[PDB]
Nucleic acid binder design. Structure first.
Ligand SMILES: [Mg+2]
Ligand SMILES: [Mg+2]
Ligand SMILES: [Mg+2]
Ligand SMILES: [Mg+2]
Ligand SMILES: [Mg+2]
Ligand SMILES: [Mg+2]
Ligand SMILES: [Mg+2]
Ligand SMILES: [Mg+2]
Ligand SMILES: [Mg+2]
Ligand SMILES: [Mg+2]
Ligand SMILES: [Mg+2]
Ligand SMILES: [Mg+2]
Ligand SMILES: [Mg+2]
Ligand SMILES: [Mg+2]
Ligand SMILES: [Mg+2]
Ligand SMILES: [Mg+2]
Ligand SMILES: [Mg+2]
Ligand SMILES: [Mg+2]
Ligand SMILES: [Mg+2]
Ligand SMILES: [Mg+2]
Lengths: 141, 57, 185, 55
RNA sequence: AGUCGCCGUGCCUACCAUGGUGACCACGGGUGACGGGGAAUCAGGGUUCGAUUCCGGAGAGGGAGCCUGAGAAACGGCUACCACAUCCAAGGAAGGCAGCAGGCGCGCAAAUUACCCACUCCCGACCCGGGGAGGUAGUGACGAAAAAUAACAAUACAGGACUCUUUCGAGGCCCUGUAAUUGGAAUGAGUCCACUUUAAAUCCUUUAACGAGGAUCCAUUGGAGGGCAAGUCUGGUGCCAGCAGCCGCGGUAAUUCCAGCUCCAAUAGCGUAUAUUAAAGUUGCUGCAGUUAAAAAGCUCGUAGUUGGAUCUUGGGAGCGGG
């Protein structure tokens, strides 16, 4: 059972300490391994350079092509894949366009029917792609 | 990879319909009166069939 | 280092369950009755009331014959009787828990000018207050949410510099008499 | 505030109030011009009618 | 026992002794470590942040050594080495914005080379001089408080509550809405006199002359299968394009895609990403579990630790006050 004395505090306080590491979230945060291995240095957004444009296939019960891009970063130098959410919007992207990327919403985990994508593009050439879609603006030719 | 030729198919394949004008609707405080006098007492049909505010039929 | 204040708090709180279908009726009901613009103004009143209700709930948990309770408890009663919500003949600090939102809405100005004639379709009342036609014992007020005391409900009338309350007519009527005299005729 | 005499005024009175009325006058040199020169006059030593010239 | 030190002390020097710390976690290493008063969340207990206007400490490119002085190992004081860097007549000389503005780079990411010593206070030989300490305007949807974008009365009836009516229907107490802006009233936003405020100016407030017909002085951001409040409407597409936090939608009749009407929620604000609290009684002191769902060492002894049986002056009274 449980210790439950009047002068047992060192034991309990100890027991909770070494036994808290067996929780996934605490362990992830308070160790640097996930942090130094995250392409973003504990950050939300990041700018980077385009170097390819590819199409990723989906999972089994669906069938499509999800129009992603290979992207290199400025600060770190690493490489990643990213997704372009909307109909007809890949054509808005040229080569070497200095985009801004972000997460998707699951904090490091893959989302949906895409095999291994956890970043989405937001701003190309500093003109707010969503606005560009809606026709509130055009690109800086 | 794959076949990227077919981007923006449907969004370019659809016709261009235009919109209309009807009015500007009341804004702010008057609009809340509209909802009150519309919902809780306007004409009060006793039997609603649990029918909704946009049920088109 | 500067001479500034930085002190500021909020005056409302959002609920936890946004779509419930059972309170949206009550909220919108209160609005069309007492004549407001937002849900937010309601949320303020609940925040006042909870805090009153909070403090009185703690004084009860204190024992009796305690000088703090006999100071603050007698003091709080005195405000709600001054404001005119709570009523004399009962000052017991346990009849405070049986208080509702409507008492503090009835006690605003927009209502009193309406219940006191003078307004004619309460949405009119607010428009008058904001158009600067009204005064309280000496002074004009441009604010509907002005809680009116009980000492000072016998002294409300139109401000004196209005077309209504003994003054010069307005931009329109001053250019139609112009037509009666030298314009149209 | 009322004073007994006009001379006691400028004995104990702020100047900006005085210059409201046409009574006191104030000199002006913008205080950037002025201290600019003040940091000059320190690169020349002692010469009286030079420092009075202010270069 | 003495030297040095403003003074006490292995702080230092000589001669002796062999001691000091440790499972009640020393020692060593890491810190996205300046500390605290405090901030957010919060039934009760707790979890996380705290560079940041107050107190204390440290530093002035990295290191070391000093003069003056009551007080400094000063840096808007000196001298050297290192790294950098400006003049140059090529002999030599001058340097330290983590002070106010400004610039380059850096990056997801952060304002004007502005005016004044008028307030607050400081310094000096001083009622008189100086102060990018400090005040004051400028950029500012980090954030917090109040509050506009219409009100009214006739014209009609979809109709309703009621007087009357075997039905319609007459008084309309009373209500709503759509069309006629039918109708005149009231206001400020916005121009621009004047005063006041101000060191001098601006803003607020006060006040003359102008200033609204609802095609205009035009309220957005997100959504409509469920969770979750709101369309089995219309056209196009055909496991393609695409949506979708999760379940899932699309393979010619799509409640989910591309569009139009219609509706729903918050409202001058609303979405998106990432940390961080509650929900989490899914880290459990308050308060989990351990036959089969994850889980009790093969069995026994055993030091530190934690926890430990019963028992020693009770009444009866006395001064009192109530039912
Ligand atoms: Mg600062
Ligand atoms: Mg540090
Ligand atoms: Mg601190
Ligand atoms: Mg120092
Ligand atoms: Mg530096
Ligand atoms: Mg130094
Ligand atoms: Mg210094
Ligand atoms: Mg310096
Ligand atoms: Mg600077
Ligand atoms: Mg910013
Ligand atoms: Mg606000
Ligand atoms: Mg739709
Ligand atoms: Mg939904
Ligand atoms: Mg948590
Ligand atoms: Mg709980
Ligand atoms: Mg469990
Ligand atoms: Mg978990
Ligand atoms: Mg419990
Ligand atoms: Mg098992
Ligand atoms: Mg015992």
């Amino acid at each position: 059972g449980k210790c439950r004395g009047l002068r047992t505090a060192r034991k309990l306080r100890s027991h909770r300490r070494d036994q808290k590491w067996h929780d996934k979230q605490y362990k992830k945060a308070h160790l640097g391994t996930a942090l130094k291995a995250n392409p973003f240095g504990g950050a939300s957004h990041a700018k980077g350079i385009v170097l390819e444009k590819v199409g990723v296939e989906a999972k089994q019960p669906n069938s499509a092509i999800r129009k992603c891009v290979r992207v290199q970063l400025i600060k770190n130098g690493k490489k990643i894949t990213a997704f372009v959410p909307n109909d007809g919007c890949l054509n808005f992207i040229e080569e070497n366009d200095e985009v801004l990327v972000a997460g998707f919403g699951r904090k490091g985990h893959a989302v949906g029917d895409i095999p291994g994508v956890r970043f989405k593009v937001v701003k190309v050439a500093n003109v707010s792609l969503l606005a560009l879609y809606k026709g509130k603006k055009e690109r800086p030719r | 990879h794959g076949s990227l030729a077919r981007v923006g198919k449907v969004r370019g394949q659809t016709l261009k319909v235009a919109k209309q004008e009807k009015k500007k609707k009341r804004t702010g405080r008057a609009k809340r009166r509209m909802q009150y006098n519309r919902r809780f007492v306007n004409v009060v049909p006793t039997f609603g069939k649990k029918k909704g505010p946009n049920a088109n039929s | 280092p500067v001479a500034r204040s930085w002190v500021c708090r909020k005056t409302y709180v959002t609920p936890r369950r946004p779509f419930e279908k059972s309170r949206l009726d009550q909220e919108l009901k209160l609005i069309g009755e007492y004549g407001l613009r937002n849900k937010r103004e309601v949320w303020r009143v609940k925040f006042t009331l909870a805090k009153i209700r909070k403090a009185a709930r703690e004084l009860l948990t204190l024992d009796e014959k305690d000088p703090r309770r006999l100071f603050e408890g007698n003091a709080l009663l005195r405000r709600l009787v001054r404001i005119g919500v709570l009523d004399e003949g009962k000052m017991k600090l346990d009849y405070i828990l049986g208080l509702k939102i409507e008492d503090f809405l009835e006690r605003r100005l927009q209502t009193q000018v309406f219940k006191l004639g003078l307004a004619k379709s309460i949405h009119h009342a607010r428009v008058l207050i904001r158009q600067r036609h009204i005064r309280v014992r000496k002074q004009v007020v441009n604010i509907p949410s002005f809680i009116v005391r009980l000492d000072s409900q016998k002294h409300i009338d139109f401000s004196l510099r209005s077309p209504y309350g003994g003054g010069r007519p307005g931009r329109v009527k001053r250019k139609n008499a112009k037509k009666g005299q030298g314009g149209a005729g | 505030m009322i004073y007994d005499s006009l001379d006691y005024a400028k004995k104990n009175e702020p100047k900006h109030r005085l210059a409201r009325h046409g009574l006191y006058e104030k000199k002006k040199t913008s205080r950037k011009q002025r201290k600019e020169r003040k940091n000059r006059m320190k690169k020349v030593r002692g010469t009286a009618k030079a420092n009075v010239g202010a270069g």
